[PDB]
Amino acid sequence: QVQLQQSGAELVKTGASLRMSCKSSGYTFTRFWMHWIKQSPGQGLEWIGYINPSTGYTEYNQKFKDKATLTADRSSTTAYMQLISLTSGDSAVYYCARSDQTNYLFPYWGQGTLVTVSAAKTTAPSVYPLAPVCGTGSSVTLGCLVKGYFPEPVTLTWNSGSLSSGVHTFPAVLQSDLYTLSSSVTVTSSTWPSQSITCNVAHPASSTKVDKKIEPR
Amino acid sequence: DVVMTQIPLSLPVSLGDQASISCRSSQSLVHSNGNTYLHWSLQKPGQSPNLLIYKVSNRFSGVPDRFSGSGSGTDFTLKISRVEAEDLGVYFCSQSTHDPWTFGGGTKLEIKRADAAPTVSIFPPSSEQLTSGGASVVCFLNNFYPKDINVKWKIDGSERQNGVLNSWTDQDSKDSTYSMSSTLTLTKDEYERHNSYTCEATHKTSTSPIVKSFNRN
Amino acid sequence: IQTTVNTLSERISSKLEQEANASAQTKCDIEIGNFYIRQNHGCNLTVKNMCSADADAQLDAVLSAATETYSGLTPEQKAYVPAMFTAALNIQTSVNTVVRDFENYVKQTCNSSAVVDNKLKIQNVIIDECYGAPGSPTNLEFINTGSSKGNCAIKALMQLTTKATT
């Protein structure tokens, strides 16, 4: 089965450069082309260019001819894209996509590599558990605030991802170079506080990893 | 260089209903060889785009027959018969007849459902945050429909407008509801100069604002 | 002789399809620009696009096609090849060693730095001589593989094909 595994999110300074990767498996690397696509919020989906992993032949979008450079290593069945002279407008999600036989379609897309272009400095989150008011119904709700971190992303689970239903993890919000994220989880009042609930926050960038039980208030 | 334009920007559709999405291009998408290389992709929230239909009419591996595409030259339409909740996402028309390849802005598929009043839960700032010297009052408004909502914060009856910082989830693929988080952040000192903190949400389900508050200590 | 060339053309096209995953409507990286001959004596030149991505698989396909076309020939007709091999490639050989001498030539010449590094999109093909009868012109067809390495193997074979006529 086809698999495109792109590299993790990247924070890099303005005017700098970076090289993201995309490792393919489950098909003949040299048999199909690899394309690259940019998904910004300002501009939509933009096609960057393609590379023939066998011959190394590449074609680029006029708009990205100076920005992106595509290479490929047959040895490790991975394809790379190098971005140069990074600016704020380069901050977007970048996709590696494998071609169909004809090289007119993109059947298979990677998970995406998040790029963040800021001279802002990496900051760890602060995980605050949100239990209800001191003073009930038949289905209590618990929360978890993730304050003042940078850059994206963070991963949040409940009891190592076992508790997954009745959950709402909200998108982060940027404010003065600091993100803020939250998540709510709802279970029957029979469950909590009789059964403890942990908030499993993680921020690979600053390399922190926290576990927060939610005790009654 | 070839501009793809989609109408509408979004479309509310009920279960079992049909959905229609148009896509117009600036040039004809017919190619020297005679093929019209226009395709339809669906990107769900969080995921990468998946190819649904290619070269106008043809369905892709494992696409139900209830997806079909039509049109020629510049005007095309995608029809989704018998809509399921899983179909929600952003549908992109794209072309590969002319280099550079281009995408449309996309059409977001909202799934209609019965009205749903939000379960509003307010959370005073945790003592572990008060220890850090800050005070954030979080309020969750979960599982509601329609999307349209606004949340007024209040301190001792007076409308607090500064420090509010909201977040919305995408539509839930299971029950097709919407959820929102609202965080009101202050300094610890300013938090302790007042008595009550209230979370007032107005919604189509009730003209009477939904009120959830607590008194300090 | 025209039928041999036409069988060959099917054997290339069919092997590029099954081994290198080629097809008639696959976008070619390399496109054939000009395909002419220096001294043409009744040959019509066309270009057929059977393109793919894997150049290594293409090259092996062009050999396997040429090898089985050659071995399909009768020993009397097969004895004509060593002579026309030397005319084009100026290397001596003999009926039994031709099948490999050709492979060596292709695998060496088409893996040259010049060939593999060639990102020139529009490429030309220039053969020097092609003979053909007045009442029956010969139909020559450069199968575009979509890569410098594959097209190299086609042009190396093309040069043998053209010597058979003359």
Coordinates of C-alpha atoms in Angstrom, one line a residue:
Chain A
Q1 CA 0.0 0.0 0.0
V2 CA 1.3 3.5 -1.0
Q3 CA 2.5 5.6 1.9
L4 CA 4.0 9.1 1.8
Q5 CA 5.5 10.1 5.2
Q6 CA 6.6 13.7 5.3
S7 CA 8.8 15.3 7.9
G8 CA 7.6 17.0 11.0
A9 CA 6.7 20.7 11.4
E10 CA 9.5 23.3 11.1
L11 CA 10.2 26.7 12.6
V12 CA 12.9 28.7 10.8
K13 CA 14.1 32.4 10.9
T14 CA 13.3 34.8 8.1
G15 CA 15.9 34.9 5.2
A16 CA 17.0 31.4 6.2
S17 CA 16.5 28.1 4.4
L18 CA 15.1 24.6 5.1
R19 CA 14.8 21.2 3.5
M20 CA 11.7 19.1 4.2
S21 CA 11.6 15.4 3.2
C22 CA 8.9 12.9 2.1
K23 CA 9.7 9.2 2.3
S24 CA 7.7 6.9 0.0
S25 CA 7.1 3.2 0.5
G26 CA 4.8 0.4 -0.8
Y27 CA 5.4 1.1 -4.5
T28 CA 8.3 1.4 -7.0
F29 CA 10.0 4.7 -6.2
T30 CA 11.4 5.2 -9.7
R31 CA 8.1 4.3 -11.5
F32 CA 6.0 7.4 -10.6
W33 CA 6.6 11.1 -10.4
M34 CA 6.5 13.1 -7.2
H35 CA 4.9 16.6 -7.1
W36 CA 4.7 19.3 -4.4
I37 CA 1.8 21.5 -3.4
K38 CA 1.5 24.5 -1.1
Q39 CA -1.6 25.2 1.0
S40 CA -1.5 28.7 2.5
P41 CA -4.4 30.5 4.2
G42 CA -4.0 33.7 2.1
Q43 CA -3.4 32.0 -1.2
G44 CA -5.2 28.7 -1.8
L45 CA -3.6 25.4 -3.0
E46 CA -0.6 26.3 -5.2
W47 CA 1.2 23.8 -7.4
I48 CA 5.0 24.1 -6.9
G49 CA 6.6 21.6 -9.3
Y50 CA 7.4 17.9 -10.0
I51 CA 10.4 15.6 -10.1
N52 CA 11.1 12.3 -11.8
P53 CA 12.9 10.3 -9.1
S54 CA 14.5 8.0 -11.8
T55 CA 16.2 10.6 -14.0
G56 CA 16.1 13.6 -11.6
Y57 CA 14.3 15.6 -14.2
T58 CA 12.2 18.5 -12.7
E59 CA 9.8 21.2 -13.8
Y60 CA 8.7 24.1 -11.7
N61 CA 5.9 26.6 -11.5
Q62 CA 7.1 30.1 -12.7
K63 CA 5.9 31.5 -9.3
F64 CA 8.2 29.1 -7.4
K65 CA 11.2 28.8 -9.7
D66 CA 13.4 30.8 -7.2
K67 CA 11.7 29.6 -4.0
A68 CA 11.7 25.8 -4.3
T69 CA 14.3 23.3 -5.5
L70 CA 13.3 19.6 -5.8
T71 CA 15.8 16.7 -5.3
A72 CA 15.4 12.9 -4.8
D73 CA 17.4 10.1 -3.3
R74 CA 16.7 6.6 -4.8
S75 CA 18.8 5.0 -2.1
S76 CA 16.3 5.9 0.7
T77 CA 13.2 6.3 -1.5
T78 CA 12.8 9.8 -0.2
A79 CA 12.1 13.1 -2.1
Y80 CA 13.1 16.5 -0.8
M81 CA 12.0 20.1 -1.3
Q82 CA 14.3 23.0 -0.3
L83 CA 12.9 26.4 0.4
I84 CA 15.1 29.5 0.2
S85 CA 15.0 33.1 1.4
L86 CA 12.1 32.3 3.8
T87 CA 9.6 35.1 4.4
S88 CA 6.3 35.4 6.4
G89 CA 4.4 34.5 3.2
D90 CA 6.2 31.1 3.0
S91 CA 4.4 30.0 6.2
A92 CA 2.0 27.3 5.1
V93 CA 1.3 23.6 4.8
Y94 CA 3.4 21.8 2.1
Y95 CA 2.4 18.5 0.5
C96 CA 4.3 15.9 -1.4
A97 CA 2.1 14.0 -3.9
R98 CA 2.8 10.9 -6.0
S99 CA 1.6 11.0 -9.6
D100 CA -0.6 8.6 -11.4
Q101 CA 0.8 6.6 -14.4
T102 CA 0.1 9.5 -16.8
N103 CA 1.5 12.3 -14.7
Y104 CA -1.7 14.3 -14.9
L105 CA -3.2 13.3 -11.5
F106 CA -2.3 13.3 -7.7
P107 CA -3.9 10.1 -6.3
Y108 CA -1.7 10.0 -3.2
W109 CA -0.9 12.9 -0.8
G110 CA 1.4 13.0 2.3
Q111 CA 0.1 14.2 5.7
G112 CA 1.7 17.6 5.2
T113 CA 4.7 19.5 6.6
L114 CA 3.8 22.6 8.6
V115 CA 6.3 25.5 8.0
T116 CA 6.4 28.5 10.3
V117 CA 8.6 31.5 9.3
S118 CA 9.2 33.7 12.4
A119 CA 12.1 35.2 14.3
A120 CA 10.0 34.6 17.4
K121 CA 11.6 32.3 19.9
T122 CA 10.4 28.8 20.9
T123 CA 8.4 28.8 24.2
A124 CA 7.0 25.9 26.2
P125 CA 3.3 25.7 27.0
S126 CA 1.7 25.9 30.5
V127 CA -0.9 23.2 31.1
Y128 CA -3.7 24.3 33.4
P129 CA -6.5 21.7 34.3
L130 CA -10.1 23.0 34.3
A131 CA -12.4 21.3 36.7
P132 CA -16.0 22.5 37.4
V133 CA -17.3 25.0 39.9
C134 CA -17.1 24.2 43.7
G135 CA -20.9 23.4 43.7
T136 CA -24.8 18.9 40.0
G137 CA -26.3 17.2 36.8
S138 CA -25.9 13.8 35.2
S139 CA -22.9 14.4 32.8
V140 CA -20.0 16.5 34.0
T141 CA -17.6 18.4 31.6
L142 CA -13.9 18.8 32.2
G143 CA -11.3 21.1 30.4
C144 CA -7.6 21.7 29.9
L145 CA -6.0 25.0 28.9
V146 CA -2.6 25.1 27.1
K147 CA -1.3 28.7 27.5
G148 CA 1.6 30.6 25.9
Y149 CA 3.5 28.3 23.6
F150 CA 5.3 28.6 20.3
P151 CA 5.6 27.4 17.5
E152 CA 2.9 24.9 16.4
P153 CA 1.9 22.2 16.9
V154 CA 0.9 20.6 20.2
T155 CA -0.7 17.2 20.7
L156 CA -3.4 16.7 23.3
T157 CA -5.0 13.4 24.4
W158 CA -7.0 12.1 27.3
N159 CA -5.7 9.1 29.2
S160 CA -3.1 8.3 26.5
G161 CA -5.8 8.6 23.7
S162 CA -8.1 5.9 25.2
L163 CA -10.8 8.5 26.1
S164 CA -11.6 9.9 22.6
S165 CA -15.5 10.2 22.4
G166 CA -17.2 13.3 23.9
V167 CA -14.1 15.3 23.1
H168 CA -13.6 18.8 21.5
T169 CA -9.9 19.9 21.0
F170 CA -10.1 23.5 19.7
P171 CA -7.7 25.0 17.1
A172 CA -4.9 27.2 18.6
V173 CA -4.9 31.0 18.6
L174 CA -1.9 33.3 18.0
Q175 CA -1.4 36.4 20.2
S176 CA 1.9 38.3 20.4
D177 CA 3.9 35.4 19.1
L178 CA 2.3 33.0 21.6
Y179 CA -0.3 30.3 20.8
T180 CA -3.2 29.3 23.1
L181 CA -5.2 26.0 22.8
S182 CA -7.8 24.2 24.8
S183 CA -9.8 20.9 24.9
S184 CA -13.1 19.8 26.6
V185 CA -14.2 16.3 27.4
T186 CA -17.7 15.2 28.6
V187 CA -18.6 12.0 30.5
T188 CA -21.4 10.8 32.7
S189 CA -21.2 12.1 36.3
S190 CA -20.9 8.5 37.5
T191 CA -17.5 8.4 35.9
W192 CA -15.9 11.5 37.4
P193 CA -14.5 12.2 40.0
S194 CA -14.7 8.5 40.8
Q195 CA -12.5 7.8 37.7
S196 CA -9.6 10.2 37.3
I197 CA -9.0 12.0 33.9
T198 CA -5.6 13.0 32.7
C199 CA -4.8 15.8 30.1
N200 CA -1.8 14.6 28.0
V201 CA -0.3 17.7 26.5
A202 CA 3.0 17.6 24.4
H203 CA 5.0 20.2 22.6
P204 CA 7.8 18.5 20.6
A205 CA 9.3 21.9 19.5
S206 CA 10.4 23.0 23.0
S207 CA 10.6 19.3 23.8
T208 CA 8.2 19.3 26.8
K209 CA 5.6 16.7 27.8
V210 CA 3.1 17.1 30.6
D211 CA 0.4 15.0 32.2
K212 CA -2.4 16.7 34.3
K213 CA -5.0 14.9 36.4
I214 CA -8.2 16.9 37.0
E215 CA -9.1 16.9 40.7
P216 CA -12.4 18.3 42.0
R217 CA -12.6 22.0 43.0
Chain B
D1 CA -2.1 31.2 -14.9
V2 CA -5.4 29.4 -15.7
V3 CA -7.9 30.6 -13.1
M4 CA -10.3 28.1 -11.6
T5 CA -13.4 29.7 -10.0
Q6 CA -16.0 27.8 -7.9
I7 CA -19.6 28.7 -7.1
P8 CA -20.7 28.8 -4.3
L9 CA -18.1 29.4 -1.5
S10 CA -20.1 27.0 0.7
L11 CA -23.3 25.0 0.5
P12 CA -25.7 23.8 3.4
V13 CA -27.2 20.4 2.5
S14 CA -29.4 18.0 4.4
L15 CA -29.0 14.2 4.7
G16 CA -30.3 12.3 1.7
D17 CA -30.4 15.5 -0.4
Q18 CA -28.3 16.2 -3.5
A19 CA -25.5 18.7 -3.5
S20 CA -24.3 20.5 -6.7
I21 CA -21.0 22.4 -7.0
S22 CA -20.0 24.4 -10.1
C23 CA -16.5 25.2 -11.4
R24 CA -15.6 27.6 -14.2
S25 CA -12.2 28.0 -15.8
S26 CA -10.8 31.0 -17.8
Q27 CA -9.6 28.8 -20.7
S28 CA -11.0 25.6 -22.3
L29 CA -9.4 22.6 -20.5
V30 CA -9.2 20.5 -23.7
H31 CA -5.7 19.3 -24.6
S32 CA -3.9 18.5 -27.9
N33 CA -4.4 14.8 -27.3
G34 CA -8.2 15.4 -26.9
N35 CA -8.5 14.8 -23.1
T36 CA -10.1 17.3 -20.7
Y37 CA -7.9 17.2 -17.6
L38 CA -10.2 18.5 -14.9
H39 CA -10.6 16.8 -11.5
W40 CA -12.4 17.1 -8.2
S41 CA -10.8 16.6 -4.7
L42 CA -12.3 16.6 -1.2
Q43 CA -10.2 17.8 1.8
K44 CA -11.7 17.0 5.2
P45 CA -10.7 19.0 8.3
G46 CA -7.3 17.9 9.4
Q47 CA -6.6 15.6 6.4
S48 CA -4.9 16.0 3.1
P49 CA -7.0 16.2 -0.1
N50 CA -8.2 12.9 -1.7
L51 CA -9.0 12.6 -5.4
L52 CA -12.7 11.8 -6.0
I53 CA -13.2 12.4 -9.8
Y54 CA -10.7 12.8 -12.6
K55 CA -10.9 14.0 -16.2
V56 CA -14.4 15.4 -15.7
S57 CA -16.4 12.1 -15.4
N58 CA -14.3 9.2 -14.1
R59 CA -14.6 8.1 -10.5
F60 CA -11.4 7.1 -8.5
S61 CA -10.6 3.8 -6.7
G62 CA -13.2 3.3 -4.0
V63 CA -15.4 6.3 -4.8
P64 CA -19.2 5.5 -4.5
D65 CA -21.2 5.8 -7.7
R66 CA -23.2 8.7 -6.1
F67 CA -20.4 11.0 -6.9
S68 CA -20.5 12.1 -10.6
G69 CA -19.0 14.9 -12.7
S70 CA -20.1 16.6 -15.9
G71 CA -19.5 19.5 -18.2
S72 CA -16.9 20.4 -20.8
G73 CA -14.7 23.2 -22.1
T74 CA -14.8 25.7 -19.2
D75 CA -18.1 24.9 -17.3
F76 CA -18.2 21.9 -15.0
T77 CA -20.4 20.6 -12.2
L78 CA -20.0 18.0 -9.4
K79 CA -23.1 16.2 -8.1
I80 CA -23.2 14.5 -4.7
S81 CA -26.4 12.4 -4.5
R82 CA -27.7 11.1 -1.1
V83 CA -25.4 13.2 1.2
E84 CA -23.9 11.5 4.3
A85 CA -22.4 13.3 7.3
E86 CA -19.0 12.0 6.2
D87 CA -19.1 14.1 3.0
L88 CA -18.5 17.3 4.9
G89 CA -15.3 19.1 3.9
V90 CA -14.0 21.4 1.2
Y91 CA -14.3 20.3 -2.4
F92 CA -11.6 21.5 -4.8
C93 CA -11.9 21.6 -8.6
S94 CA -8.5 21.5 -10.3
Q95 CA -6.9 21.3 -13.8
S96 CA -3.8 19.7 -15.3
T97 CA -4.3 20.6 -18.9
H98 CA -2.0 23.7 -18.7
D99 CA 1.2 24.2 -16.8
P100 CA 1.2 25.5 -14.0
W101 CA -1.5 23.3 -12.5
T102 CA -4.2 25.2 -10.6
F103 CA -6.9 24.8 -8.0
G104 CA -10.2 26.5 -7.2
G105 CA -10.8 28.3 -3.9
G106 CA -13.0 25.4 -2.8
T107 CA -16.5 24.9 -1.7
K108 CA -17.2 24.0 1.9
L109 CA -20.0 21.5 2.4
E110 CA -22.1 22.3 5.5
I111 CA -24.4 19.4 6.6
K112 CA -27.8 20.6 7.8
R113 CA -29.4 19.1 11.0
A114 CA -32.0 20.0 13.6
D115 CA -31.3 23.0 15.8
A116 CA -29.3 22.3 19.0
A117 CA -28.9 24.6 22.0
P118 CA -25.3 24.5 23.3
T119 CA -24.3 23.0 26.6
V120 CA -22.4 25.9 28.1
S121 CA -19.9 25.2 30.8
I122 CA -17.8 27.9 32.6
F123 CA -14.5 27.4 34.3
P124 CA -12.8 29.7 36.8
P125 CA -9.0 30.0 36.5
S126 CA -7.2 27.0 38.1
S127 CA -5.2 27.7 41.3
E128 CA -2.0 26.4 39.5
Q129 CA -2.4 29.4 37.0
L130 CA -3.2 31.8 39.9
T131 CA 0.1 30.7 41.3
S132 CA 1.8 31.8 38.1
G133 CA 0.3 35.3 38.5
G134 CA -2.3 35.2 35.7
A135 CA -6.1 34.5 35.5
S136 CA -7.9 33.0 32.5
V137 CA -11.6 32.3 32.6
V138 CA -12.5 29.7 30.0
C139 CA -16.1 29.0 28.8
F140 CA -17.0 26.1 26.5
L141 CA -20.1 26.1 24.3
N142 CA -20.5 22.6 22.9
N143 CA -22.6 20.7 20.4
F144 CA -24.8 23.4 18.8
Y145 CA -26.4 24.2 15.5
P146 CA -26.4 26.5 13.5
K147 CA -22.8 27.7 13.3
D148 CA -23.9 31.3 13.9
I149 CA -23.2 32.3 17.5
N150 CA -21.8 35.1 19.6
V151 CA -20.6 35.1 23.2
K152 CA -20.6 38.2 25.5
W153 CA -18.4 38.2 28.6
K154 CA -19.4 40.1 31.7
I155 CA -17.8 41.2 34.9
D156 CA -20.2 42.4 37.7
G157 CA -22.9 42.8 35.0
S158 CA -20.7 45.1 32.9
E159 CA -19.7 43.9 29.4
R160 CA -16.0 43.0 29.4
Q161 CA -14.7 43.4 25.8
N162 CA -10.8 43.2 26.2
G163 CA -8.8 40.0 26.7
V164 CA -11.5 37.8 25.1
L165 CA -10.0 35.3 22.6
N166 CA -12.2 32.7 20.9
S167 CA -11.9 29.5 18.9
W168 CA -14.3 27.4 16.8
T169 CA -14.2 23.8 15.7
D170 CA -15.0 22.5 12.2
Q171 CA -18.4 20.7 11.9
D172 CA -18.4 17.3 13.6
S173 CA -18.4 14.4 11.1
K174 CA -20.6 12.3 13.5
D175 CA -23.5 14.5 14.8
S176 CA -22.8 17.6 12.5
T177 CA -22.8 20.0 15.5
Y178 CA -20.6 23.0 16.2
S179 CA -18.5 23.9 19.2
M180 CA -16.8 27.0 20.5
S181 CA -14.2 27.9 23.2
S182 CA -14.0 31.4 24.8
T183 CA -11.1 32.4 27.1
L184 CA -11.1 35.7 29.1
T185 CA -7.6 36.5 30.3
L186 CA -6.7 39.0 33.0
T187 CA -4.0 39.8 35.5
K188 CA -4.5 38.1 38.9
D189 CA -5.0 41.5 40.6
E190 CA -7.8 42.6 38.2
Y191 CA -9.5 39.2 38.7
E192 CA -9.7 39.7 42.5
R193 CA -11.2 43.2 42.3
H194 CA -14.6 41.8 41.2
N195 CA -17.3 39.4 42.3
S196 CA -19.1 37.7 39.4
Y197 CA -18.0 36.4 36.0
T198 CA -20.6 35.6 33.4
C199 CA -20.6 33.8 30.0
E200 CA -23.6 35.0 27.9
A201 CA -24.3 33.2 24.6
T202 CA -27.0 34.3 22.2
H203 CA -28.3 31.7 19.7
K204 CA -31.2 30.9 17.3
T205 CA -32.5 28.2 19.7
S206 CA -33.4 30.7 22.4
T207 CA -33.9 34.5 22.1
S208 CA -33.3 34.6 25.9
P209 CA -29.5 34.6 26.2
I210 CA -28.0 31.4 27.7
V211 CA -26.3 32.5 30.9
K212 CA -23.6 30.6 32.9
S213 CA -21.7 32.3 35.7
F214 CA -20.1 31.9 39.1
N215 CA -19.4 34.2 42.1
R216 CA -15.7 34.5 43.2
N217 CA -15.2 32.4 46.4
Chain C
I1 CA 11.8 -5.8 -43.8
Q2 CA 9.1 -3.1 -43.1
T3 CA 7.1 -5.7 -41.2
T4 CA 10.1 -6.6 -39.0
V5 CA 10.4 -2.9 -38.2
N6 CA 6.7 -2.7 -37.5
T7 CA 6.8 -5.8 -35.3
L8 CA 9.7 -4.3 -33.5
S9 CA 7.6 -1.1 -33.0
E10 CA 4.9 -3.2 -31.4
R11 CA 7.4 -5.1 -29.3
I12 CA 8.9 -1.9 -28.0
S13 CA 5.5 -0.3 -27.3
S14 CA 4.1 -3.4 -25.6
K15 CA 7.2 -3.9 -23.4
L16 CA 7.4 -0.2 -22.5
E17 CA 3.7 -0.6 -21.4
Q18 CA 4.1 -3.8 -19.3
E19 CA 7.6 -3.2 -17.9
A20 CA 8.1 0.6 -17.7
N21 CA 4.4 1.3 -17.2
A22 CA 4.2 3.5 -20.3
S23 CA 1.1 4.5 -22.2
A24 CA 0.1 6.6 -25.2
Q25 CA -1.3 9.4 -23.1
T26 CA 1.5 9.8 -20.5
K27 CA 3.1 13.3 -20.2
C28 CA 6.7 13.1 -21.5
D29 CA 9.5 14.8 -19.6
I30 CA 11.6 14.7 -22.8
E31 CA 9.8 15.7 -26.0
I32 CA 11.2 14.9 -29.5
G33 CA 11.9 18.2 -31.4
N34 CA 13.3 17.6 -34.9
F35 CA 13.6 14.1 -36.4
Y36 CA 15.3 14.2 -39.8
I37 CA 17.9 12.4 -41.8
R38 CA 21.1 13.8 -43.5
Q39 CA 20.5 11.9 -46.7
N40 CA 17.0 10.5 -47.0
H41 CA 16.3 8.1 -49.9
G42 CA 12.6 7.4 -49.4
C43 CA 11.8 7.2 -45.7
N44 CA 8.9 8.7 -43.9
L45 CA 9.6 9.9 -40.4
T46 CA 7.0 9.9 -37.6
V47 CA 7.3 10.2 -33.8
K48 CA 5.2 8.1 -31.4
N49 CA 4.9 9.0 -27.7
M50 CA 5.0 6.0 -25.4
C51 CA 6.3 7.8 -22.3
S52 CA 7.0 6.8 -18.7
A53 CA 9.0 7.8 -15.6
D54 CA 11.4 4.8 -15.0
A55 CA 14.3 5.2 -17.6
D56 CA 16.1 2.1 -16.3
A57 CA 13.1 0.0 -17.0
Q58 CA 12.6 1.7 -20.4
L59 CA 16.2 0.9 -21.6
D60 CA 15.8 -2.8 -20.5
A61 CA 12.5 -2.9 -22.4
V62 CA 14.1 -1.5 -25.7
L63 CA 16.7 -4.3 -25.4
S64 CA 14.4 -7.1 -24.6
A65 CA 12.2 -5.9 -27.5
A66 CA 15.2 -5.7 -29.9
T67 CA 16.6 -9.0 -28.7
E68 CA 13.4 -11.1 -29.3
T69 CA 12.7 -9.4 -32.6
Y70 CA 16.3 -10.3 -33.7
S71 CA 16.0 -13.9 -32.4
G72 CA 12.6 -14.2 -34.2
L73 CA 14.4 -13.8 -37.5
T74 CA 15.5 -16.8 -39.6
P75 CA 19.3 -17.7 -39.6
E76 CA 19.6 -16.6 -43.3
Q77 CA 18.1 -13.2 -42.5
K78 CA 19.8 -13.1 -39.1
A79 CA 23.3 -13.3 -40.7
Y80 CA 22.7 -9.8 -42.3
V81 CA 22.9 -8.1 -38.9
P82 CA 26.6 -8.2 -38.0
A83 CA 27.4 -6.3 -41.2
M84 CA 24.8 -3.5 -40.6
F85 CA 25.9 -3.4 -36.9
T86 CA 29.4 -2.4 -37.9
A87 CA 28.1 0.2 -40.5
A88 CA 26.4 2.1 -37.7
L89 CA 28.4 1.5 -34.5
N90 CA 31.7 0.6 -36.2
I91 CA 32.3 -2.4 -33.9
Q92 CA 33.0 -5.9 -35.3
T93 CA 30.8 -8.8 -34.1
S94 CA 29.3 -12.2 -35.2
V95 CA 25.8 -13.7 -35.2
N96 CA 26.1 -15.3 -31.7
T97 CA 27.7 -12.3 -29.9
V98 CA 25.5 -9.5 -31.5
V99 CA 22.7 -9.8 -28.9
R100 CA 25.2 -8.8 -26.1
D101 CA 27.5 -6.5 -28.0
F102 CA 24.4 -4.4 -28.6
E103 CA 23.4 -4.5 -24.9
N104 CA 27.0 -3.5 -23.9
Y105 CA 26.9 -0.6 -26.3
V106 CA 23.5 0.7 -25.1
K107 CA 24.2 0.1 -21.3
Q108 CA 27.5 1.9 -21.6
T109 CA 26.6 4.7 -24.0
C110 CA 23.2 5.5 -22.4
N111 CA 24.6 5.6 -18.9
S112 CA 27.2 8.2 -19.9
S113 CA 27.2 11.4 -17.7
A114 CA 26.3 13.4 -20.8
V115 CA 23.1 11.3 -21.4
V116 CA 21.9 10.9 -17.8
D117 CA 22.5 14.6 -16.8
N118 CA 20.6 15.8 -19.8
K119 CA 17.6 18.0 -18.6
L120 CA 17.1 19.5 -22.1
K121 CA 13.4 19.1 -22.6
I122 CA 13.1 19.4 -26.4
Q123 CA 15.6 17.0 -28.0
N124 CA 16.4 16.3 -31.6
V125 CA 17.2 13.0 -33.4
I126 CA 19.6 13.0 -36.3
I127 CA 20.3 9.8 -38.3
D128 CA 22.6 10.0 -41.3
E129 CA 21.2 7.6 -43.9
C130 CA 17.9 5.8 -44.7
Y131 CA 17.2 3.8 -47.9
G132 CA 13.8 3.0 -49.3
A133 CA 12.2 1.8 -52.6
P134 CA 10.5 4.4 -54.9
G135 CA 7.2 2.6 -55.0
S136 CA 7.4 1.6 -51.3
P137 CA 8.9 4.3 -49.0
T138 CA 10.1 3.0 -45.6
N139 CA 8.2 4.0 -42.5
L140 CA 10.5 5.1 -39.7
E141 CA 9.1 5.8 -36.3
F142 CA 11.0 7.1 -33.3
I143 CA 9.3 5.8 -30.2
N144 CA 9.7 8.7 -27.6
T145 CA 10.4 7.1 -24.2
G146 CA 10.2 10.4 -22.3
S147 CA 13.8 10.4 -21.0
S148 CA 17.3 11.0 -22.4
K149 CA 18.4 7.5 -21.3
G150 CA 15.5 5.7 -23.0
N151 CA 15.6 7.8 -26.1
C152 CA 19.4 7.0 -26.3
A153 CA 18.6 3.3 -26.5
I154 CA 15.9 4.0 -29.2
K155 CA 18.4 6.1 -31.2
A156 CA 21.1 3.4 -30.9
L157 CA 18.5 0.8 -32.2
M158 CA 17.3 3.3 -34.8
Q159 CA 20.8 3.4 -36.3
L160 CA 20.7 -0.4 -36.8
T161 CA 17.2 -0.3 -38.3
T162 CA 18.3 2.3 -40.8
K163 CA 21.3 0.3 -42.0
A164 CA 19.1 -2.7 -42.8
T165 CA 17.4 -0.7 -45.5
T166 CA 20.8 0.4 -47.0

